[PDB]
Structure 1
Amino acid sequence: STIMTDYNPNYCFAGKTSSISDLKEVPRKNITLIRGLGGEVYEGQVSPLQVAVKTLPEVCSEQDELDFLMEALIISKFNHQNIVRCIGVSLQSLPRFILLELMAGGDLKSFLRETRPRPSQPSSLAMLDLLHVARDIACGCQYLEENHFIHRDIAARNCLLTCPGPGRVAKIGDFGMARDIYRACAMLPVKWMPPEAFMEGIFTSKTDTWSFGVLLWEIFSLGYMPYPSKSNQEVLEFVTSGGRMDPPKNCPGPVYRIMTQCWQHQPEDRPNFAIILERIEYCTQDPDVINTALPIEY
């Protein structure tokens, strides 16, 4: 790409600088698309390795090209089991591809909605399944925090699962907001943002702690939209004024208490991710938490 070549942006993560020349270019003849899944995401294979393929439309702006490169650089430099892997890229053929770990369980929000206990599947999910998802994402967030990377958009829609069934691992699977900020409103994820985002606009890992609290609410509600029946501005005014969400239906007290600590008004009063993990791990050990039945959706 001449835009990518002429600009040739550097990307810094964890004290190391990378650029387009550092990306692992997979020959296009080795890549086959199998089906569309979800911009466009396809299932593909690399000669074989099963992958997810993100594509860049051939009709795109110069900014879109640079965005796509920065997304590749960002994902390629992460090294953690709870962040989706990047197999490589194919940027020297059109349309351009980024090749990612296939996450056959799909996105977490959709999974929660589709796998809710119902009279026909009364035991589809248990509390422990939800705590394992929470732990998995908290582990990824702790890696980001330890590497001074602020995600800015932790939400169930941005988490992915390795498979639908038992043994699934949840991973962070989108970095678009971080990418936009690295390169730099009705599209802001207001419902995931702490009060101070709207005051001084200052982001820290404590902003990700707040968002993680909202993710935990999403998990234990089985995929409900946060602040049901409030608009973005209503939520902004609500949370600023000290308003917080009620516990999800049947949510154990100890889990709800993790949410409420994540939502402390003062950032310094919120737990870091090592503390969040410890609390999630204690909940997972407590028989009265894990023996709590999830509500049936009639």
Structure 2
Amino acid sequence: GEAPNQALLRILKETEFKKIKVLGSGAFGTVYKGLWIPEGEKVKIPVAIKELREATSPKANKEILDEAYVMASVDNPHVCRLLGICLTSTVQLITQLMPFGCLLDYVREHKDNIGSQYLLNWCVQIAKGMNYLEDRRLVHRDLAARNVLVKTPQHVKITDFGLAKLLGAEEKEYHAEGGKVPIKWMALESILHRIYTHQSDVWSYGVTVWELMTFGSKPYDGIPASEISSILEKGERLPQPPICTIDVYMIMVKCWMIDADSRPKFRELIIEFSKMARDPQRYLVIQGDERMHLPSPTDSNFYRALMDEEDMDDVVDADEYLIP
């Protein structure tokens, strides 16, 4: 009827996680960094760990296990996958640590060192990620630069599947209802009719690319969310970022067409951004571009800027830790 989801959900003992330190907190809950030392392995795996506030709110464990389901069912170089869960007082999600954090913050804090080649490569990688999600019939529904993580400056991955939805073997639109929504990243049809498709995700990709190309500007800044559907109906759109050629901005604009089926396919975005990445200074115009550098895996205090030296002997990235 539809293919069986044979993903493994790994239950991980609390006694295998060490050096637990806070990365951030809020409504979403708390995320920590830590090490995961599977027992009798001789590996230490850098991890992030997401928990909500309290063992209560049966709603909350439902939401987070919904997220776990989705994160366990993906496997792609440009998507974050679940390593497992920990069943404590609270339900904790465990995943590969992405040490440079979220891309929104990254572009903000490193504006002066981000050249054309990085921007376009990110665009390619996010498109690969999103294409993979489409092939697996998932609609993310919250693609935003905040929901893209940086493993290294060269390697980003989509995360935050807490709003993602599958689609039946012959179903096209998800129809949602209520709940707080990222209105500024949403297709018009999603705001108006709570319709959500692969093509509504393309809209969100457009906005995400705008965020990167403006070094993390806030879209429709100062506009109240309640006014967005009108702005859009009138035909207004996010403006051309200074660094963008018409070539790049046109792609953005095509992502924001009213006719969903007229928007680009992720497979097409991969191709276009890939072509652009072979000659980046032809497509993005950044002052002092050719002379920028960001941390690479082949640098000294790359592995020392994260780790304790006590640990480093047996550290293995989650991307190199695979199980039967």
| TM-score normalised to structure 1 length | 0.84
Q: Which runs of 5+ in 1 are unaligned?
A: 1-11, 118-123
CA apart distance, 1:58 = 3.2
Q: Do residues 53 (structure 1) and 39 (structure 2) align?
A: no
SS at match of 1:35: strand
The corresponding residue for 2:80 is 84
Q: Do residues 44 (structure 1) and 34 (structure 2) align?
A: yes
Counterpart AA for 1:198: I
Corresponding pairs, count: 272
Counterpart AA for 1:46: W
SS at match of 1:150: coil
Take 1:218 and 1:282, find their aligned partners in 2: how far apart are those partners? Answer: 21
Q: Do residues 153 (structure 1) and 142 (structure 2) align?
A: yes
Q: Do residues 192 (structure 1) and 185 (structure 2) align?
A: yes
CA apart distance, 1:291 = 6.5
Residues 41, 53 of structure 1: 8 Å contact kept: yes
27-36 vs 202-211, which deviates more?
Answer: 27-36
CA apart distance, 1:186 = 8.2
Tell me the C-alpha RMSD between the 2 structures. 2.5
Counterparts in 2 of 1:230 and 1:107: CA distance versus 1, 3 Å: same
Counterparts in 2 of 1:257 and 1:238: CA distance versus 1, 3 Å: same
Residues 32, 44 of structure 1: 8 Å contact kept: yes
SS at match of 2:163: helix
The corresponding residue for 1:213 is 206
- Misfit runs of 4+, over 6 Å: 179-186
Take 2:247 and 2:279, find their aligned partners in 1: how far apart are those partners? Answer: 9
CA apart distance, 1:227 = 1.4
Take 2:95 and 2:250, find their aligned partners in 1: how far apart are those partners? Answer: 35
Alignment partner of 2:282 out of 280, 289, 297: 289
189-198 vs 267-276, which deviates more?
Answer: 189-198
| TM-score normalised to structure 2 length | 0.78
The corresponding residue for 1:174 is 160
CA apart distance, 1:182 = 9.9
CA apart distance, 1:88 = 1.3
SS at match of 1:106: coil
SS at match of 2:70: helix
- Matches of residues 84-103 of structure 1 in structure 2 within 5 Å? 84-91=80-87, 93-103=88-98
- Matches of residues 253-292 of structure 1 in structure 2 within 5 Å? 253-286=246-279, 288-289=281-282, 292=285
Take 2:140 and 2:222, find their aligned partners in 1: how far apart are those partners? Answer: 26
The corresponding residue for 1:248 is 241
Counterpart AA for 1:63: K
Take 1:253 and 1:196, find their aligned partners in 2: how far apart are those partners? Answer: 26
Counterparts in 2 of 1:182 and 1:90: CA distance versus 1, 3 Å: farther
Residues 125, 157 of structure 2: 8 Å contact kept: yes
CA apart distance, 1:87 = 1.4
Residues 67, 179 of structure 1: 8 Å contact kept: no
Q: Do residues 129 (structure 1) and 118 (structure 2) align?
A: yes
Query: Larger % of helix: which?
Result: 1
Deviations 1:176-205 (A, max 9, x none): 222698997683111111111133322111
Q: Do residues 106 (structure 1) and 101 (structure 2) align?
A: yes
Counterparts in 2 of 1:49 and 1:184: CA distance versus 1, 3 Å: farther
